Amino acid sequence: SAEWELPRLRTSFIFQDDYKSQDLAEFFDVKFYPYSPPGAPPVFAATSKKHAVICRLTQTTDKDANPCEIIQLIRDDGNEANCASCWSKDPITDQPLLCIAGNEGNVKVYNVTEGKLYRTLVGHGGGINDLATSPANPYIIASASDDTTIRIWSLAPEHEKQPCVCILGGEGHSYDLLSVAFHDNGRYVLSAGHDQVINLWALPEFPNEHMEIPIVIYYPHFSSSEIHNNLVDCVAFYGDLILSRACHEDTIVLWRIEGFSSDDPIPGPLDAPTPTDMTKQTRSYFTPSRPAMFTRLAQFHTPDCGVQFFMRFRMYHVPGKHPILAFANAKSKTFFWDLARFGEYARFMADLKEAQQSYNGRVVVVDQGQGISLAQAQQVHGPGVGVVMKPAWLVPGFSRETLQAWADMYDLSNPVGLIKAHRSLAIDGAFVGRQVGWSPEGEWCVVVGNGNRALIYQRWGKER
Amino acid sequence: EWTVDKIASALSVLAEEVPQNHSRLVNFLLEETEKRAPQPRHLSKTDPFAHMKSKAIDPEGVPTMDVKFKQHSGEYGKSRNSGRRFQYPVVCIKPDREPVPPYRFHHAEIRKNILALNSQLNFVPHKIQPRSQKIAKRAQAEYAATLAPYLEPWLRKLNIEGCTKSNLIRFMASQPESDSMTPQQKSNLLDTYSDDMGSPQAVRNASMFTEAWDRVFNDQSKLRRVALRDILMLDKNVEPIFDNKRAKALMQKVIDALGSYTTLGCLICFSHDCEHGEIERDNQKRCFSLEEIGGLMPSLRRKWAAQIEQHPPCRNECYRIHGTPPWSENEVGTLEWMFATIGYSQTLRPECFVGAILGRPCWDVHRKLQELDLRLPPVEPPKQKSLPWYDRRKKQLMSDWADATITHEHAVRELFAPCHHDGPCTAANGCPCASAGTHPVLCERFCLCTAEECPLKFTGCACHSSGKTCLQRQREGRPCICVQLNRECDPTLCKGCGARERADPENAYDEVLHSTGCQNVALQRGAAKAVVLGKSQLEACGYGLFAAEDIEEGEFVIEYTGELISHDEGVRREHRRGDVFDNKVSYLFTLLEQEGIWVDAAIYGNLSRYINHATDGNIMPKIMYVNHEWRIKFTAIKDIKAGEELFFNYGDNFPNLTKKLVERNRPLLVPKTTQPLFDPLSKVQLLPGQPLPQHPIDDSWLLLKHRDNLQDFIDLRPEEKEFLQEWDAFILRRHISSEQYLPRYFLRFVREKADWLVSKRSRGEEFSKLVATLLARRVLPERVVIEATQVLNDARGRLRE
């Protein structure tokens, strides 16, 4: 039963307006530290335009206690205003490093436990809008910039004198970039932004030696401006599938590149497609009648984002726990979907239809998660009545309206349908979400946004 | 018996499997992805934050900020109380580094100008496709791709006579809507399908299936709809018919056999996909090729006429020793085009070369030649007044030459194809050089006329000196006609000034050589002065370019390279980069004003793109004619010391195209400077006295584009693409613009690729066609065809183990 529980608002805070105009400051990013031993108290940094707010969360038996304590608070004492963060580690000492990047085009790397600068990464020709660390190497970071390139940086000691190991350049992108993401294997990179192009790049391996110049990549291996019809502001891998969001569309799109598998060898830079036909808005190295280089799979419905952009979603995806997609819109709502609900619903509907025909209607539906099994329920009738087990979280023969409400949330039959959120939580006052982050064990979900506001959701709590 | 109603009813039931398969697919993929969740990596063994406590104040001179916490509980998230506010000390951290000056795009170096394709205006920061037609056509395209794989299994299950994918394609072709299709496209559809659709009931059934499909799946009210026709156009045998990427007695055989080479072979750089030629509005390309000057025959006929107006035996059982396995027709064709192309030669004969191309003995081909009895067409065996403004024997301009010709006035020239008519170069004969423009221009090296025939034929300059010559202010009495015409010397035609050696990039750094002789080949030489990127001294400018060595007045400094673009492409680019909604952010260097060619260094170019504007500059740009390319050089107009910033007067060189459209209703060291200096790629700050970074030019991305351009021709056989691409990949890296250097690079190619070429029959075959084309142009000396015969016989001999 506990495995199906979804979060609920547990704590809320407002950080003093630091772009002061009295309340036009925002938290633009939130990132949980990913390198702590299993079970450690989870720690996240919330990045405002001028501050990094570092918080520890500790579960509590007292519903009136405050689980959130601020353990470090850092001000960017320069002129840069910031909107992007990611975590790394000192390669010598293993101390946590927080990278912060903003409108002057530099990444600052902070030694957060001692409160001093570790170093600066200089090189971009315009403001930076997103940062991501490689999951395969904690010293490798990607930055996405108004200068329309991605730079890949290494904090490894051998790269200290020239830490830009790769530039994603060429003509694949033509305007400001808003989002950059790593595949779990650390070799595939997604990038997207105002030009409405989503590009998938394959990184070469980088030498464990000083590099006088970065490796320059001129061609993405997959390129498309056709999944969305508007500027793209958030992109991520979900395993090998893709999740992405655009302005004006009120959806998060799940889709896949045909022929792409991270089990295959990584292609080399000279395997990439080149734009030989200028009328093609999609091209792909991976392609296996013409049909398609990509397939739309599903659309999570995300109403009331309006004309707002730079709004980011976050999946929680760890072994042995349900995958949860979280996103907050531009009208004071936070949305959750439990991706495990989809297969359970499909199983239930298949058992239900199967038993409808095997018994011509003589079917009883009984809720799961009770002391009652598909055995104890079968001994209450016999071979004449079929008993179908229904997930408890499926809440109302069933009426057409009840069936339609379930389908709106769990039916995956239509790639251009709109999947309703499985939980929709309202926020007090006017709120625009900018970013979502998940604690390692999935018990905390933190949404940050305008008004320097952080919303802290919890599940599996200790409250008594 | 079927009806539209019955078929439509049946397609509707079949269509039910589409969302069922989809739900099953998405659920399968989500389940797979759940199982593949990654374990967290690189965890520390200790919690690094364990020792840090809440910094809430229970301070003196320390900055503070407030935070207000609310606690929540229940299902609706109701607050437990109004909140509690706390004060926290702030740790203030400054960065230790300034950002580099700003830029957009990754700036990459090109050795020479590259030719862009026209783009579509698909994005403008804020002819464009209405977003309504954008959304709708994308929706239909996705639905069509979803439905396409169902058509054949559904047709199989319905099993209706005449309802075949083939027959539905033929029905579609016959309908009036084919309003989307052209001549020759019908012929290729009828080549594959024809127009017979079977029995009357077969034709009737196909018609009713098409109607029934369009009723079920092409409902006009819906956004996601697809006509059967749109499915059928996706078919792998239909689509190529609508793909426009096409490259293209005894002599008709040879003309056809050499057509890929005469059509794509660049006359300037000898590559088959290169930076020369003309890009049309739909990106079809007219290559600067033999076909531009009449195909193979006018040049070949002249080679014959020159031949009829005028060594050791080979190590492959030479027919000169003898003269005596069934011959393929390909093998016979090979002997045909080599024979026709060697022509009436005295020093060279086909048998040996053909014998090295084929795996055959020389006496074999001679015996086959003798029985074939190939006969060349017979070739038939006027005085013209010299012009008063140009003497091509003394190589001298005179009189009102600057009023008589526009040869030297690049901004007004229009690029017509070089001469290939039969008579004198006059208006009467339709010669574009004499008459296509407001004034006559000289005939150039690609015109088919000879200097003996034609008073317009450029013959090079007469300069010679043991000292420096071909100078702007020539203290040698007679000026350099090349300089006067705003052109660099030709390595073949300017024989006295040493241009043959000084225009050779392999001598680019022989300072002894270049200290005398021709000073008018700097763009060909390819050597730039040492320069270094930095922050400009001019406030409100970002980057600038600085001398990294002393430069004397009159020296060549650097070339302005970039993408070559059309007028409308410049307009599109100004829009796409946000320059139309104003403050100038787009710089398009006018190369040929009247022809409409601009140089765009926004992404591809060299360090010259960073040179800033000043009214009183220290360097001066000039457009030059350089062996039938137009190029931009900068020359110092002051002595410049190492470390000083370069400037030139932008003048009218960078027009706002949309605005004018709307109006038409001693080692090299980092020098010492005040300004910070940067590596162009790493943007690392450079320190004075360190070695100056000189990074070799990265061209493999450009070689890939050119290789793929060839791969895209539906017109070319795999065997053709393989050789053309192998030759191009080699020859494009030599950056040839003069036939003077071709024979050297040709022999290097034959030697490096000798084992490769004899390893597969079609490679030698295709290589022979290139050889035949270059011999027909008289651009490849007979002596290197002789040598290539030995290189290939050797390699074939080395392989027999």
Ligand SMILES: [Zn+2]
């Ligand atoms: Zn060329």
Ligand SMILES: [Zn+2]
């Ligand atoms: Zn011989």
Ligand SMILES: [Zn+2]
């Ligand atoms: Zn002529």
Ligand SMILES: [Zn+2]
């Ligand atoms: Zn001419």
Ligand SMILES: [Zn+2]
């Ligand atoms: Zn002529």
Ligand SMILES: [Zn+2]
């Ligand atoms: Zn001269």
Ligand SMILES: [Zn+2]
């Ligand atoms: Zn000359």
Ligand SMILES: [Zn+2]
């Ligand atoms: Zn000269």
